[PDB]
Amino acid sequence: RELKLLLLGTGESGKSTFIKQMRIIHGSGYSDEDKRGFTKLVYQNIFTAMQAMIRAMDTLKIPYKYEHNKAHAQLVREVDVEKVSAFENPYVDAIKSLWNDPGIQECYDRRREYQLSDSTKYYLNDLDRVADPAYLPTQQDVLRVRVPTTGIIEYPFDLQSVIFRMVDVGGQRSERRKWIHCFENVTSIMFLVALSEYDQVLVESDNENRMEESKALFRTIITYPWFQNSSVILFLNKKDLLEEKIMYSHLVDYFPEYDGPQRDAQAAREFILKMFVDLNPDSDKIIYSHFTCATDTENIRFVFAAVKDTILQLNLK
Ligand SMILES: Nc1nc2c(ncn2[C@@H]2O[C@H](COP(=O)(O)OP(=O)(O)O)[C@@H](O)[C@H]2O)c(=O)[nH]1
Ligand code: ALF
Ligand SMILES: [Mg+2]
């Protein structure tokens, strides 16, 4: 009855964000209790970002500008999110002072040297409103919250006239080996790759570029013999991150083969798309690609409007 889909990609790529977007558009919008729960999630995300960037500053031995905030920094090291609660007054001022500190700002601008959530800037801009006790996060705040998924999570859903069940899976290397069981009757595969992953290395490995791992995984998935009868769609996510990363980072250093002009977001996107589509072994196969940004509802709407039609045309029964 209902067709089975997979959302595949390396960790942090953005699969769960697309699941949230699909639920929001063609499902049930999140309720007040949902946002109340997500407030704590946002709180621990902010705490994790603060701790990670302080640890990065320490490892990189970058001096601080504010001596007083150093005390707060120590307090930051003492905060533990296992026995977590709502944000408290003594922490909001310290976080604001740290974020306003130019030294840690430069450290974050150098974020390529360590792992960090892409939502850090958004929450930092939010500042008091998010940290305000009267926290009423909007759909954007809920979408821009990071919660590492793990294990196979089937998400039943249906279109206006057809039923298409999705499957969200983890992207961490240790977890990918659990996918064996979700390939039983795949009707079409959606693959997510972070356009901005070209600069950051994996989390599980600090020496392998994320883009190389993503390309290897895409090749491995296409090489699967039993997917020959299933369509594949390559969602190029996080274009809004890449349009700034390229402006701030040169794609030549990551992949020198991209000899195109610098600062051209469209050129870099086209180069990445060509590089990924080249990995297919046999040209008779067709690969559909769509630039997108899971954090924007309109882009997901537009992409899905055609993805559903393509899937329906692919499977006539
Ligand atoms: N700015 C931006 N952030 C994104 C986009 N896609 C995903 N993210 C963020 O990336 C973080 C991690 O994505 P995640 O949901 O874990 O994807 P998953 O690893 O495949 O499950 C989330 O907190 C999202 O807010 C995007 O297109 N643009
Ligand atoms: F990297 Al994930 F769920 F965020 F596998
Ligand atoms: Mg996830």
Q: Which domains does the chain have, with CATH numbers?
A: 3-27+157-314 (3.40.50.300), 32-143 (1.10.400.10)
Q: Whose CA is nearest to atom 17 of ligand 1?
A: 14
Token readout for 247 is: 């402006």
SS3 assignment for the chain: CCEEEEEECCCCCCHHHHHHHHHHHHCCCCCHHHHHHHHHHHHHHHHHHHHHHHHHHHHHCCCCCCHHHHHHHHHHHHCCCCCCCCCCHHHHHHHHHHHHCHHHHHHHHCHHHCCCCCCHHHHHHHCHHHHCCCCCCCHHHHHCCCCCCCCCEEECCECCCCEEEEEECCCCHHHHCCHHHHCCCEEEEEEEEEHHHHCCECCCCCCCEHHHHHHHHHHHHHCCHHHCCCEEEEEEECHHHHHHHHHHCCHHHHCCCCCCCCCCHHHHHHHHHHHHHHCCCCCCCCEEEEECCCCCHHHHHHHHHHHHHHHHHHCCC
Out of 8, 13, 202, mutate this one to test ligand 2's pocket (max ligand atoms within 8 Å of CB): namely: 13
CA separation for the pair 174, 156 (Å, rounded)? 26
Token readout for 299 is: 């882009």
| Amino acid, res. 261 | P
Out of 15, 38, 118, 235, mutate this one to test ligand 1's pocket (max ligand atoms within 8 Å of CB): namely: 118
Active site residue 253: no
CA separation for the pair 122, 304 (Å, rounded)? 25
Active site residue 150: no
Residue 296 C-alpha from the chain's centroid: 13
Beta bridge partners of 5: 188
What is the position in ligand 1's atom list of the atom closest to the CA of 17? 15
For Cα atoms 245, 41, 51, give the angle at the middle one, nearest 5 degrees.
Answer: 60
Method by which this entry was solved = cryo-EM
As for ligand 2, residues whose beta carbon falls within 6 Å of it are 11-12, 16, 148-149, 170-172
CA separation for the pair 138, 173 (Å, rounded)? 32
Out of 149, 178, 214, mutate this one to test ligand 2's pocket (max ligand atoms within 8 Å of CB): namely: 149
Which residues touch 72 (CB under 8 Å, ≥6 apart)?
93, 94, 97, 98
What is the position in ligand 2's atom list of the atom closest to the CA of 172? 5
Which residues touch 252 (CB under 8 Å, ≥6 apart)?
258, 259, 262
Half-sphere exposure of 104 (CA within 13 A, CB side): 26
Active site residue 10: no
Q: Nearest to residue 314, comparing CAs of 214, 204, 190?
A: 190
Contact call for residues 188 and 53 (beta carbons, < 8 A): no
Contact call for residues 302 and 21 (beta carbons, < 8 A): no
Residue with tokens 């009267």: 134
| Amino acid, res. 100 | N
137 burial (CB, 10 Å; 0-12 / 13-18 / 19+) is buried
**Cα end-to-end span (Å), the chain:** 10
As for ligand 1, residues whose beta carbon falls within 6 Å of it are 9, 11-17, 118-119, 144-146, 149, 171, 237-238, 240-241, 293-295
Contact call for residues 99 and 131 (beta carbons, < 8 A): no
237 marked among binding-site residues: yes
Residue 114 C-alpha to ligand 3 middle, in angstroms? 20
Residue 142 C-alpha to ligand 2 middle, in angstroms? 16
CA separation for the pair 182, 230 (Å, rounded)? 14
CA separation for the pair 22, 166 (Å, rounded)? 10
176 marked among binding-site residues: no
272 burial (CB, 10 Å; 0-12 / 13-18 / 19+) is buried
Question: What is the structure's resolution, reported in angstroms to one decimal?
Answer: 2.9
> Residue 35, Cβ neighbours under 10 Å: how many?
18
CA separation for the pair 215, 269 (Å, rounded)? 15
CA separation for the pair 189, 30 (Å, rounded)? 26
CA separation for the pair 5, 18 (Å, rounded)? 13
